[PDB]
Amino acid sequence: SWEIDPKDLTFLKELGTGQFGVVKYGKWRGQYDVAIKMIKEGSMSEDEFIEEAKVMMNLSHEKLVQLYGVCTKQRPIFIITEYMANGCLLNYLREMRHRFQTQQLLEMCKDVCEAMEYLESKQFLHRDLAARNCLVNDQGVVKVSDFGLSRKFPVRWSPPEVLMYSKFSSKSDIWAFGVLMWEIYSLGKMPYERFTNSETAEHIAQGLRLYRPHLASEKVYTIMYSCWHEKADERPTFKILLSNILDVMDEE
Questions:
Q1: d(C-alpha 239, C-alpha 55), whole Å
Q2: Distance between CA atoms of 244 and 197, rounded to whole angstroms?
């Protein structure tokens, strides 16, 4: 069901990801590659954890990193997720010592927009969409992770209404997606690299945004820029963005 027997875990490994990162790898039920993550003790009630795990497991999309189950009969609780061989998107973008053509960067954006259009259609809020929270598999497909119970503050990824009023909505995920497009097109730079949090917020308050990365065409920048409207209701939906992204794919 939602509950998993740790005895169904075989080939337990400690694997590197990026230069200093580490992942606990296993195989689940003889054929599923999984990452094993622990849940902070006492931060949640057991019943509260199970319901949230149930919601997350019913979130099925090829571009969302899947949750396969949880172990609760043990201390600490752990979760098993879809293993992603190429690791964090941020590190993967900076590891571009080789590859990225602009078509590949736009495809990354499309992968994420699909996952997010799915989440939006289920009225589920990510709340921390960022390149650090996307994972890349062995085929180079980008999937969104760290939504749900896979959770100082992501100020550089947050719209003004989150910073001031804590008003989370799909439209705040929209803003963060624009920042994520920026991280992709700049190949993994830090948004607003040399800014205090008040400087970033004063910069936004002045109607100023993240510069056009030079790998981004005018069209691509229009799409990411559209995500950062001051008014939440003036920012697009993930369905509209997808259609914009699919339009720009046809035009190249």
A1: 22
A2: 31
Please pick, among 128, 138, 146, 233, the residue that the annotation labels catalytic. 128
Q: Where are the domains of the chain?
A: 1-83, 84-252
Q: Taken in order 43, 78, 147, 91, is the CA torsion positive or negative?
A: positive
Q: Which fold has domain 84-252?
A: Transferase(Phosphotransferase); domain 1 (1.10.510)
Q: How was this structure determined?
A: X-ray
Say which CATH superfamily domain 1-83 falls into. Phosphorylase Kinase; domain 1 (3.30.200.20)
Rounded to the nearest 10 degrees, how much is the dihedral formed by the CA atoms of 198, 200, 203, 205? -70
Residue with tokens 């065409």: 217
How many CA atoms does the CB half-sphere of 237 hold within 13 Å?
9
**What residues form the annotated binding site for clofedanol?**
81-84, 149
Amino acid at 69: G
For residue 99, give Cα distances in angstroms to 63, 74, 126, 130, 162: 22, 44, 29, 21, 36
Q: Are 142 and 134 in contact (CB under 8 A)?
A: yes
Residues of the binding site for ATP: 15-23, 37
Question: Resolution of this entry in Å?
Answer: 2.3
Give the neighbor-by-neighbor strand order of the sheet with 87-88: 87-88, 134-136, 142-144
173 is catalytic: no
Q: Which residues contact 232 (CB under 8 A, 6 or more apart)?
A: 159, 161, 167, 169, 171, 172
